[model samples]
Each structure stands twice: as C-alpha cells, then as structure tokens.
Target: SMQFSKMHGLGNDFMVVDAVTQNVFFSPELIRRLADRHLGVGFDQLLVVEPPYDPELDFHYRIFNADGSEVAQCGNGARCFARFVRLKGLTNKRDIRVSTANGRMVLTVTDDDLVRVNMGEPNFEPSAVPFRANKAEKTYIMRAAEQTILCGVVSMGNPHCVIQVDDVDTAAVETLGPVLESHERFPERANIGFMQVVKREHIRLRVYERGAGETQACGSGACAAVAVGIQQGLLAEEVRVELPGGRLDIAWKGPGHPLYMTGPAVHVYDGFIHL
Candidate 1:
C-alpha cells in the first residue's frame, strides 16, 4: 500500500505523496480518479515530493491539478511540501529550498507554524507568461465575450491573469473563466482571477484555475493578485487575499523583486488507496 498525507494551505487542499521511498506514476486519468470527491481523496491538487536536482535544495516538487494535468508550479503546494516533509521525518531543517518547473523556491518554517515562501519574481512580459501580446506591458486589455477587461498578466511560476472587478463575489467567473482560459492570447491557458479591492491592504478574490476550476484558494493566485494589484496602484505592496477557503498574506517588493507568501498548512488525515 502507498502512504499519503492530505494537507491544505488556507483551504487549497492537496494529496501529498513521498516519492523518495515510493514510485508513484501519475497520468491525467489517474489524477482525475484520485481527485474525485466521492471516489477518491477529493483535493484540488496532488503533490509529489521528490529528491532535489540541486544538492543545496532540500527537495523537488511536482504538482498535478485536479484534472491530473502536471503544472509548472503551485504556491500553496510549496508550503505544504515543506510541512509535509518535515512532519514525515524526511528533513530536520526549518529553512528549506525546493526546485520546480518554474524555478527554485526558498521556504522558511517558522516556530509559529507558518510557512513563508519566496515565490520568485512576477513575470509580466507576455512571452514570459506565454500570453500573446504585441508588446510587453504592465497590463493588457483583453476581450472576454462582450465585456472588456483590463488585466495585469504575471507568471508566478504559472501564468495568471488578474482582473480587478467591482465585486469579487459576483464577478463573472463562471461565465468568463473558460473564455479567458482558452483566450487566443494565452496559448497555454492561464489561471483567471477576479478580485475586488476592499481596501488598500485587503482584497477579496475568486480564481478559476487553469487545470482546476474554482478552488477554495490558490497560493500562487494570491501572489499574482498582489503583484498585479500593486503594479496597477490598486492596492498596497502587502495585502491579504481573502478566498473561499481562507486567507493568504502576500507581500511584494515591486515588479522586479520576488513575492513572499505566508500561510498555514493543515494535515487533514492520512490513508492508502489503490488504483
């Protein structure tokens, strides 16, 4: 039987498996089966922790969305990796570094039970975010059906499109999410974010993730939201992004600097399953 741990970061839950001692091969079909709410563990994503490519880094992480698609990176999943490895006796270090398809991430495990991750820098260039643009700009004006939205595009290891709306709760996530995800500009698709600024330091957001639909919260989504919000002068450098699952604290130095995200990760339970 394979051992697994269920963990969540601010309600963005995932099923984590240790790749060091177990060989877990996942395909899109396997992910779909594992993420089924009734048939499987029911999680937004599945995290596989493996040995790091760089000897200096503590581990390497792979993220699979609910649909079983492998993605570049996951912000909340990184936090869960740090906590899961330590709790599982894989490592004794509080400060750990991890490598992903996006890049390397540095994580700090605090005594207060919070994980802080340096989510690299936000990439705004259309080509970097893989969003089609005539030229790289801080923001892009895109058409979503009949409605036009001015969005700030950034890559927090994954492509994210953040749109500021009048109200986050009632934003057209359901209506426009699929369109934006398959927009001609973003060839690889992107996570769609609808955000409402409640104040200078707080915002409410709902995200229709690329591979996963609307999840409770997205760690990378939160970081991308803050980066875009601050660049647009719509929010402060540090802000709290409130999502359906919970809250994430995001801080950014500016356009060229890395974004830091801090949040709590909880272990829901552990179990074994067969395919």
Candidate 2:
C-alpha cells in the first residue's frame, strides 16, 4: 500500500506522496487510475515531493495531471507543497526553494496562516509560452466558433491566455474553454482564463486549465491574469482574484519583479492504497 495525503489550495486538490523515504512509484496508468473521481482517489493533480535532484534546490516539485500527463508547474499545488512539507515534519524552514521541470521558485509561509509563493517572472514571449504569434503584444486575437476574441498571452510557469469578459458567470467557459485549451497556437496547449475586472483592485476569474479542465481555483491563472491586466494597464500592481473556491492576493511589479501570490492550503485526509 502506498501512503498518501490529500490536500488542496482553494479547492484545486492534490494527492501528495513523499518520494524521498517511502520509495513511491506511480506509472502514468496508475496516476490515471488513482485520479478517477468515483473509482479511485479523486484529485486534480498528484504532487510528489522528492529530494532535490538539481543539487542546487531545496526540493523537487513534481506535478502530474488528472489524465496522467506530467505538467511543468502548478501554482495552487505550490502553496500546498509548502504546507505539506511542514505538516509532514519534512522541514522546519519557513522559506523553501524548489525546482520544477523548467525553473525554480520560492515558497514562504506567513505568520497569518497563508502560503506565499514567488511564482517566478511572467513570460510573454510567444516562443516561451510555446504559442505561435506574429508578434508579442499586450493583447492578441484568437478565434472560436466564427467569433474573434482579444486575449493576453502569458506564462506563469505554465501557459495561460487571459480574455476579458463582460461577466464570468455567463462566459462561454464550458464551450470556448476546451476550444482555447487545444488551440493550435499553443503547441503545449494552454490554460484559458476568463476575467471580469470588477475594479482596479479586484477581479473575478474562472479558468479552464490545460489538462485538468476547470477547477475551483487556479493560482498560476490568477497570476497570469494579473500580469496581463497590468501589462495592459487595466489593473493595479496588486489585485484580489476572486475564484469559485476562494480568493487569492496577487501582486506583480511590472516586468522585472516576480509575481507574488498568497493563499490558503488545507490538509484534507491521509490514507493508504494499493496500485
């Protein structure tokens, strides 16, 4: 039996396992089997915390999608990663430097019971987002169902395209979301964020993720929306992103500063299961 801890950051849930001492091994098929909502342990992603393989990092952060695909980054999962280490008695440090598949990030715990993540600098280059574009701009055009939409493309450790919508509740997420996720421009696919700018300091968001579909909250999506909103001069340096699960405080200081996100992580349960 493999021991696991279930956790979530604003309802974007995860199945966590310590690969350092437990000798955990999960095949893609096993991940899919375990991610089944009714038949197995339901989760949006499977987070594995391992001893740093890069030698220069504090830990190795690995994320597996619900469909068994291994993704490069997950913002909601990052916060939970910090919380998981502390709860498991893995580390006592308040700040942690972790390495993902592509880059490194810092996770810090605040005294007020929130996990703050330095989500790295936002990437706007079309090539970096693996998005094909004629030129990088504050807003770009995308088409779905014979209608064109203006979107701001960004990567917050993962690719996302933020689209301004009149209202998040009535947006075409269920239809346009899947269309945008598989859009040909993004070779790696992309998370689609529907944002309703309520005020300069507050906004409502809904994300249709790349491989996981829509969740209650998306940390990277919130960061990406803020980055693009600021880039377009629509929002302040700091903004409150309201999502279905909860709210996240996101801040970015223009091009050079890393996006900072603060949110809550909850430990739900612990269990043991066989593959």
Candidate 3:
C-alpha cells in the first residue's frame, strides 16, 4: 500500500507522493495504469517529492505525465509540491528551493494561500529548446499535417509552442494540437498553447500539454504565452492569464528576467492505494 495526496493547481489535478518517506518506485506501465481515469486515481501528472540529491536544495521535484512519460518541469505541479511539503510537515519554510530535472525552482507560499513559482528564464535558442531550426527567431513557420503553422517556441524548463489565435474558443486545438506537439521540428515534443489576447493586461489561453493532452490549466503554458506576447510587443510586464481552470498572474520584467507565476493549489483528499 502507498500513501498519496490528491492535489490540484487551478484544476490541473495531480496525485502527489512523498517518496522521501515512502519507498515507492513507478514504472511506465504502473504510471499508465494508475493514470487511467476510470480504473485508477486519474490525474494530469504524478508529482513525486524525493529527498534532494543536492544538499543545498530543500527537495527534488519529479513529474510524470499521464502517458507514463517523465518531464523536467511542471509549473502547476511545482506549486502543489510546495503546499504539500508544508502541509505534510515535511518543511516549515515558506520559501522553498527544489531541484528539477532541467533546472532549480524557488517556490514561495504567500499569506493569501497562493503559491508563487520562480519558473526561471525562458530559453529561446533552438538548440537549447531542442527545436530544429537554423537560428532562433521570434516565430517559426512549420508545416504539419498538410497545413502551415506559425508560432513562437520557448522553453520554460519544458518546450512550449504558442500560437496566437483570433479566438481561443474556436481554435482547432483538438485537431491541430497533437500534430504540432509531435511535429518534426521539436524533437522532444512540446505543449501547444492557443492564446487570445484580450488586452495588454489579460489573455485567454488553452494548452494541449505534451504527454498529457489538454488540461484545465498549465502554469508553464501561461508563462510561455506571456513571454511570447511580451517579446512580440503585445503584452505588458504583468498579465493575467485565464485558462479553463482559472486565472493565474504572471509577471516578467523582460528578456533575461525570471518569470513569476502565482496561482492556487488545492488539496483535495488523501488515500492509500495498494500498488
């Protein structure tokens, strides 16, 4: 049997496990079976909190997608990780630092019960993004599924491709999302975001996350959308991103500055599962 907590950040639900206290190992087959909505404890991703490998950090955050794939970063999961640690008495610190697969993250718990994540700087270099391109540009044009698509690519620990659409509600996300996620240009695959700028201070977004199809919200997706919008001179320094789950406030001073994502993390329930 394994102890776990069900949590969510703006409805992007997760099954959080404390690997530091419990000896738990997940294989791809196990993760897939556990992620099944009907047969298992369904979630967008499984968040694992492990004892930090690096002495300086508070913990090691690991993310596994629903499809049984592991990824380097998950913005919403980061927030839930922070709240979980504190609530579970793992740590009492309000500001926590954790090591991730690709980079380090600082999670701050505010008095208002909102968790803020320092998601690090967005990487635009094609090689760094692991995106195939001659050189980094503001936007790239790629042909996929017999259609021409233009979008901005950036890495918020994980790769994301943002497409500005006239209306997010009508965008062909179901049809175009998978095709673009596995597009040949992005060797590692990417989260596809459909963004509609409502104003300089607000935007509506929907993301088809890599490894986990479309979720209610994506923290890194909002950061990527704002980063691309600011880079294109369409948005301001601080903006509100409204997703299907809820709203998240994202602030980025500019290029070379780290982005801050502030949102809510909800602890739904706790249970024990035999694995």
Question: On lDDT, who's better, 1 or 2?
Answer: 2
- The best-first sequence of candidates by TM-score reads 2, 1, 3
Model 1 clash pairs?
none
For all candidates in order, the CA lDDT equals 0.85, 0.88, 0.88
Candidate no. 1 TM-score:
0.74
Q: Give TM-scores for every candidate, taking all chains together and pairing residue i with residue i.
A: 0.74, 0.74, 0.73
Tens digits of per-residue lDDT for model 1 on 1-275? 77899987767678999988788777788789888988877887899899899888888899889977888744537778888999999998899888887788778998987788887888887788898887767778888889888898988878999988889877879889889988888999999998899998999999999979888878788888899898888888889889888888888989668789888889888989876
Better of 1 and 3 by lDDT: 3
lDDT of 2 by residue, 1-275 (tens): 77889997767778999877788677888889899877788888899999997776789878999888889744537888888888888888888888877567788888876889887899899989989997789999888777898999998868999999989999999999999999989889999999999999899999999999998877889999999999999999999999998999998898988889899888889988876
Off by over 4 Å in 2: 1-4, 18-48, 53-56, 61-76, 100-103, 126-134, 140-148, 178-190, 210-213, 271-275
Alpha-carbon runs more than 4 Å astray in model 3 = 1-4, 17-54, 61-76, 100-103, 130-136, 139-150, 178-190, 209-213, 271-275
Poorest 10 consecutive residues by lDDT, candidate 3: 71-80
